[PDB]
Design a protein around this motif. Structure first.
Motif: not given
Ligand SMILES: O=C(O)c1ccc2c(c1)nc(NCc1ccccc1)c1ncncc12
Length: 326
Positions: A275-299
């Protein structure tokens, strides 16, 4: 043998055009006067070319000259023909002239570029969405013109941040798509190589670029450049397999009946899809959203037929804010 594949979109675009559009070997090249340009300073060095800021003494326009190191004339003709075909297209670098002196050189428009080392640490969530949308315009365009880039990576995306302008550069590895053609898999930077390249499936297509874009998006939102950090071509696929899991990888092999290198049999092993939550941290929290993960997953999919097209990608919710604003 392997199972054939064809692009879901823009499949027969080149077939419907005149022969000369894609038959670049028969392209005659007209060399302009090299004395028109004076070199100011060196901007970068690579394997196959060097790049210099130059002035055009005719009209005092600032310019960039890319002096080509020895490459097969075929591949020069190819880069030139592609640039001319795509000239005027959205976010495509403009080829201005072609000169020599007897080494060949390509003259391009000048673009201000923020160092992507210094820039990718300062992009907001919106800025990534924006520039990703701009890249997709270029990719959808060149795909629609029947052309694969095959070297999508941070370096080849020039961003003038002050003017919110972006250009896709370096079409020296780009090729024309033709249904049924088997291509060279020794293309693209290692971190951006699609699985099709790593397992040596030669009948790939435009979708190769969409994987590479996925690697770029991953690094941007998760703040890890590069995201898939392999030590070699074999290990690169292991890094991918450790994220996307091995179940899907072997289904890809079976589907296309791919003759997998015996080396891989040892080192791939069995890995679960993460799951993509593994790569989420305090530093990169503000860039990650449910939309971004959906988009990335389909790429990021092994099966190249199952990845998003550029036009599909552009219609994703990730880019709803951007679409509204223009
Ligand atoms: O091969 C090409 O299609 C091409 C086209 C245009 C440019 C270019 C390469 N390379 C430039 N600079 C070198 C560089 C670029 C990015 C990061 C690090 C170094 C450049 N600079 C300003 N304006 C345009 C260009």
């Amino acid at each position: 043998g392997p199972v054939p594949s064809r692009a879901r979109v823009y499949t027969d675009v080149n077939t419907h055009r005149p022969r000369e559009y894609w038959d670049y070997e028969s392209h005659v090249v007209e060399w302009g006067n090299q004395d028109d340009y004076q070199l100011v300073r060196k901007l970068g060095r690579g394997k196959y070319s060097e790049v210099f800021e130059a002035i055009n003494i005719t009209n005092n326009e600032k310019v960039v000259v890319k002096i080509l190191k020895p490459v097969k004339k075929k591949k020069i003709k190819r880069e030139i023909k592609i640039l001319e075909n795509l000239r005027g297209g959205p976010n495509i670098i403009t080829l201005a002239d072609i000169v020599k002196d007897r080494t060949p050189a390509l003259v391009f428009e000048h673009v201000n570029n923020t160092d992507f080392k210094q820039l990718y640490q300062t992009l907001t969530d919106y800025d990534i969405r924006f520039y990703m949308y701009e890249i997709l315009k270029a990719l959808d365009y060149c795909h629609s013109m029947g052309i694969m880039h095959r070297d999508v990576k941070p370096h080849n995306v020039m961003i003038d941040h002050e003017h919110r302008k972006l250009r896709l550069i370096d079409w020296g590895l780009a090729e024309f798509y033709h249904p049924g053609q088997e291509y060279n898999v020794r293309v693209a930077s290692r971190y951006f190589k699609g699985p099709e390249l790593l397992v040596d499936y030669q009948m790939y297509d435009y979708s190769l670029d969409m994987w590479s874009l996925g690697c770029m998006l991953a690094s941007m939102i998760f703040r890890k450049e590069p995201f898939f950090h392999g030590h070699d071509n074999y290990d690169q696929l292991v890094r991918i397999a450790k994220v996307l899991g091995t179940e899907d990888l072997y289904d890809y092999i079976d589907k296309y009946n791919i003759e997998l290198d015996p080396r891989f049999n040892d080192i791939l092993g069995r890995h679960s899809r993460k799951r993509w939550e593994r790569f989420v941290h305090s530093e990169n929290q503000h860039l990650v959203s449910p939309e971004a993960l959906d988009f990335l997953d389909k790429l990021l999919r092994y099966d190249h037929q199952s990845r998003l097209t550029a036009r599909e990608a552009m219609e994703h919710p990730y880019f709803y804010t951007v679409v509204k604003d223009q």
